[PDB]
Design a protein around this ligand. Structure first.
Ligand SMILES: *[C@@H]1O[C@H](CO[C@@H]2O[C@@H](C)[C@@H](O)[C@@H](O)[C@@H]2O)[C@@H](O[C@@H]2O[C@H](CO)[C@@H](O[C@@H]3O[C@H](CO)[C@@H](O)[C@H](O[C@H]4O[C@H](CO)[C@@H](O)[C@H](O)[C@@H]4O)[C@@H]3O)[C@H](O)[C@H]2NC(C)=O)[C@H](O)[C@H]1NC(C)=O
Ligand code: NA
Lengths: 390, 394
């Protein structure tokens, strides 16, 4: 019943195997003759062990600015901080003469150094294909009431959590009295890096990531290409001004436009977009209560029939009888004399499971276009509801 | 002497005596002007400033969001409403979300969702207007003759020093007269934004085009606030049935800075803007310019080289000498010679009438010469105690 309400909802009809395409945000209702209806959804795709590859500085700070200068023919300018790896330096040639303290007129050497510090960095992580995990949720059309309409699936036969990984593509899901469903999925269909910048994530190309013009370190940190976040403007003969370029967060963000965005789930990456092809084994799937007799007593609508986005109807009824467990007489009819079924049920084998009076139950129907009637129960006491589709 | 050391240095000579000389003053450039029976003067356009810049528009480049809230309705329960959706400090997004019996709705279909966030600017950039009349050109004047080495780069005390002068030229006042104490005076008649704006962002300044400035895709407000186009820095992302995520785009300082590459960069000088690049055509009046110290006698005592004679980029030779005598103020005997017996002058001086201005012993003085090609001798002083320096020009 988990697909009921989902916009991107598909319907597959089957018989030993049914092929199903599971997409993120999507849900598949699977039907097969003499088998219960099952809702299947790819709920999350996660990657578990992302190793840091390279981080890039997008906001830097500079301090301890100093200079050294030489006169023409006096050789290269020298600062002791030009061997400190935390410093960024620029070596230039400046016009010198009697006006600024040289015996000769010509180009002298100038060196300017600044202590570079990163304020904010973005980290790129590796994705190993084996480290992908697909979580699939299963939910049978088991005649649940609205008070049964995600947690506690291990103790509820109608629900199951399946874990699919590239190494373990096959799984078997027990559904209590419904028997079991087998799943054999192909990940494959679902050059990249996992990028994080200020609690924002993306899946970026390898070539693009490596050619980012910002200071970087591999895997206290040593920044390679600090020159990218600084600017050395010539100011005087014995001094050169050095200034930080300012935060590149916005520029990087707009460069990432169109690129695939991702999310986090603790220390694990979550793929918002994914596709998974599964082959479902139907041999062990079984309808509960084929031995049940048709319910003989009166039904009453608890909830007003409501149309889903796909034009199907959800119906909730209450049952006055004590002859439970029994089959729910349910159909749609165009004429109330003949009562030949029109449309079809989505819920295979709708049942009142309890032997108690005034018990609730929910079912889903696929009405024909135009006017028809929802019909619950048998004989004189049968309840009717006018319906219109499109 | 202020042109000595300048790479972009020009030399202009005046006619037989002469009354006027035309000069082109560029930023970073310097002009040495010479004329017969007149002292040599160095003239430089030192700064161009703009005085009364009115703010036109400010753009937000770093924003912050707070007070994030949502409202969601079931299908047929109408439109989602927050009271902040009409508050001008807020940025909102109205969307449709999947609803049903699992979401508390009696019906299955799309329900209205509204998300709103209070927008605040952290950092903004301001664009200012430049009125053509509000331009000011500062010209520095330096006379050759008295000054030693230490005065090539100084600009402290020109108000009390006859050798130096500050001239202020504006579009409304293009003519100025500069008094040079005993050197008389020099007259200046110079010839000095319709599509340009002055931009300021985090103590960094530039001159930007009008069309470029107005088409900047960032939140803005006119004058010196209500932010128009807050959406430029706010991203809405759908997250759930009753909630949607809203996030700030992050600082655009870097992106704006790289977009400004190639564009003309500017500077500030207090509350006034400073144009790093400029050009000024001046006509100089030479009639009132006079050679101070023609009455001076030739220095009789010994000279000694303080600085070794050095060739400038243009092949001139700067000489700095110290003077042992107390008979100051006096004329420095200075020339170049090819032979030390005959001593007939060769080349010429750049510094017209070099002098020892002080009556004190061991005073310094600097002069500039224009040597002939090949070998020559720099001769300073008279008689037996005269000092010589061999020189070669190629
Ligand atoms: C920029 O220019 C200023 C001033 O301009 C110039 O001042 C003269 C030096 C001269 O060249 C002028 O043509 C011109 O206006 C410079 O400031 C001067 O700096 C000097 C040296 O630092 C000072 O000289 C001192 O003057 C005192 C006068 O009473 C005297 O006590 C000092 O002692 C000297 O004499 C005794 C022996 O008796 C002994 O201690 C030493 O022999 C010592 O030199 C000394 O002569 C001037 O006072 C300063 N003048 C002003 C107005 O500030 C400035 O240094 C220069 N800056 C740069 C960057 O070039
Ligand atoms: Na003066």
């Amino acid at each position: 019943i988990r697909c009921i309400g989902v916009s991107n909802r598909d319907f597959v009809e089957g018989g030993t195997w049914v092929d199903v395409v599971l997409e993120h945000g999507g849900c598949v209702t699977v039907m097969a003759q003499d088998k219960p209806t099952v809702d299947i959804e790819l709920v999350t795709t996660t990657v578990s062990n992302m190793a840091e590859v390279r981080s890039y500085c997008y906001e830097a700070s500079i301090s301890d600015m100093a200079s050294d200068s030489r006169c023409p023919t006096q050789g290269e300018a020298y600062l002791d901080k030009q061997s400190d790896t935390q410093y960024v330096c620029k070596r230039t040639l400046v016009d010198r003469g009697w006006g600024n303290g040289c015996g000769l007129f010509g180009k002298g050497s100038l060196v300017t150094c600044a202590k570079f510090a990163c304020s904010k960095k973005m980290t790129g992580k590796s994705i190993q294909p084996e480290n992908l995990e697909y979580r699939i949720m299963l939910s049978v059309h088991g005649s649940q009431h609205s008070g049964m309409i995600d947690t506690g699936h291990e103790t509820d036969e109608n629900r199951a959590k399946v874990e699919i990984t590239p190494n373990s593509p096959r799984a078997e899901a027990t559904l209590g009295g419904f028997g079991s469903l087998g799943l054999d999925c192909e990940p494959r269909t679902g050059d990249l890096y996992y990028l994080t910048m200020n609690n924002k994530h993306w899946l970026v190309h390898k070539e693009w990531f490596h050619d980012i013009p910002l200071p970087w370190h591999a895997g206290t940190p040593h920044w390679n290409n600090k020159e990218a976040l600084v600017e050395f403007k010539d100011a005087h003969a014995k001094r050169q001004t050095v200034v930080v370029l300012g935060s590149q967060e916005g520029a990087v963000h707009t460069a990432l436009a169109g690129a695939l965005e991702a999310e986090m789930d603790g220390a694990k990456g979550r793929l918002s977009s994914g596709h998974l092809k599964c082959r479902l084994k139907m041999d062990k799937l079984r309808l509960k209560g084929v031995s049940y007799s048709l319910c003989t007593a009166a039904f009453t609508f608890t909830k007003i029939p409501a149309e889903t986005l796909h034009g199907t109807v959800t119906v909730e009824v209450q049952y006055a009888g004590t002859d439970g467990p029994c089959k729910v007489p349910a159909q749609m009819a165009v004429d109330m004399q003949t009562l030949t079924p029109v449309g079809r049920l989505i819920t295979a084998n709708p049942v009142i499971t309890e032997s108690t009076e005034n018990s609730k139950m929910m079912l889903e129907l696929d009405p024909p276009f135009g006017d028809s009637y929802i019909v619950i129960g048998v004989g004189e006491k049968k309840i009717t509801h006018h319906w219109h589709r499109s």
